[PDB]
Design a protein around this ligand. Structure first.
Ligand SMILES: CC(=O)O[C@H](C[C@@H](O)C[C@@H](C[C@H](O)C[C@H](O)C[C@H](O)C[C@H](O)CCO)OC(C)=O)C[C@@H](O)C[C@@H](O)C[C@H](C)O
Ligand SMILES: [Cl-]
Ligand SMILES: [Cl-]
Length: 391
């Protein structure tokens, strides 16, 4: 019959936030990016279409307030170009400018812009004042465009090509409304979820390719949002807040979440040889963190899938991969494969391993560093997933 007409918002695109000034123990301080009387135009791919949208901005890791002088949205026509006929003001309690205190985030008013799944929109921000922006999604795998003055409504960004970036600045979610029954699948992880080594501006991150499979199969109302952070660890901050500490924000609190795919831990194992020797952790400590996350998500009624840790022998031997890291990987994967608490295993390790040597990534899927898949490897990750799990 007629679908009940009550409208609801769903996360259509997400980006997990990191503090660009946070560094490893003993490391030299790191400076944040700043803007001063400048516009940043971001581009992002929507997983879910619908009738209206809203924008979530962030000063989560600011050390002082920031003021978004203007925020605008439009359909992207490639590079920095927009369809000016679709340009809309993004307001916050009716105001075009909004100030976020340090440590806070804010979702905008609804914007009347009809959008389709797997299309790109541009979200443009003007900062009139000197604005420090430590709150970023560092690894965007996507070009952002920076220019002088308020260009938020301009057809393109006029600037030098050296002013571009591949990060997202203070932009963390895009939510879209619909009356239809809708699933939201959150992919939670490290660089292998974030999509490091996939082709920039090509939407070839593994969650993008999973999304492609869903829409090709007809499931336009099953969305996939990305909560990976390159370099992320369960148990310790850097890169990004620890997985344990960000799970509530980046998984449980995602608007409309129904399913989660968790793939995290290789950095907990790999960082201790050299990057962070004071932060050695056991497989048991990783398993305990996973357990608490699984319990929390199941209590919220989320379907929880855990991926096996992909082989990584050859990845900076002696300085990331070690015999100790391999032993812990096998203990963790045994735990995953035998868990009766999770709703299912997604065996990424089995899908991507080298048939000639199961401790290495299949050479046809190796980006070249023995750790991160290439586009074909991210395609193979997506292909391994039983879409019945996401219903
Ligand atoms: C899964 C995940 O999240 O992955 C990534 C981290 C991972 O890349 C860490 C490295 C290994 C280190 O580099 C190894 C050191 O280099 C060894 C040192 O050099 C030895 C020393 O020189 C001897 C001197 O005697 O994994 C690798 C490459 O194996 C996530 C993220 O950080 C990627 C991001 O940073 C890319 C952005 C554009 O920055
Ligand atoms: Cl599966
Ligand atoms: Cl399938």
């Amino acid at each position: 019959g007629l679908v009940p007409r009550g409208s609801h918002m769903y996360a259509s695109w997400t980006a997990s936030m990191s503090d660009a000034t946070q560094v490893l123990p003993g490391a030299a301080p790191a400076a944040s990016q700043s803007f001063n009387n400048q516009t940043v135009r971001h581009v992002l791919r929507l997983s879910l279409g619908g009738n209206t949208l809203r924008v979530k901005v962030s000063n989560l890791f600011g050390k002082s307030p920031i003021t978004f002088t203007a925020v605008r949205v439009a359909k992207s026509t490639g590079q920095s170009n927009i369809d000016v006929s679709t340009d809309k003001s993004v307001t916050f309690n009716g105001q075009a400018s909004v100030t976020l205190e340090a440590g806070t985030e804010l979702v905008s008013d609804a914007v009347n812009l009809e959008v389709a799944p797997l299309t790109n929109i541009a979200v443009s921000m003007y900062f009139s004042s000197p604005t420090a922006m430590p709150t970023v999604h560092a690894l965007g795998v996507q070009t952002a465009f920076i220019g002088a003055g308020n260009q938020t409504a301009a057809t393109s960004i006029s600037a030098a090509a050296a002013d571009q970036s591949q990060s997202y600045y203070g932009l963390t979610a895009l939510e879209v409304s619909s009356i239809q029954k809708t699933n939201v699948v959150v992919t939670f992880g490290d660089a292998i979820t974030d999509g490091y080594k996939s082709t920039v501006d090509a939407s070839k991150r593994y969650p993008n390719q999973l999304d492609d499979r869903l829409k090709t199969a007809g499931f336009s109302r099953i969305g996939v949002v990305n909560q990976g952070i390159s370099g992320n660890r369960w148990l310790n901050d850097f890169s990004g807040p620890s997985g344990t500490s960000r799970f509530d924000r980046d998984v449980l609190n995602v608007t409309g979440i129904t399913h989660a795919i968790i793939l995290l831990g290789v950095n907990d194992l790999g960082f201790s040889a050299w990057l962070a020797p004071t932060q050695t952790v056991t497989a048991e400590q990783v398993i305990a963190a996973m357990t608490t996350a699984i319990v929390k998500a199941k209590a919220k009624g989320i379907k929880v899938f855990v991926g096996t840790i992909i082989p990584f022998k050859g990845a900076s031997m002696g300085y990331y991969y070690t015999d100790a890291a391999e032993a812990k990987r096998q203990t963790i994967n045994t735990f995953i494969r035998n868990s009766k608490e999770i709703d299912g295993v997604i065996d990424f390790a089995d899908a991507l391993k080298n048939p000639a040597d199961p401790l290495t990534i299949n050479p046809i899927y190796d980006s070249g560093d023995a750790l991160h898949p290439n586009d074909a490897g991210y395609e193979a990750m997506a292909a391994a997933i039983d879409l019945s799990k996401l219903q």
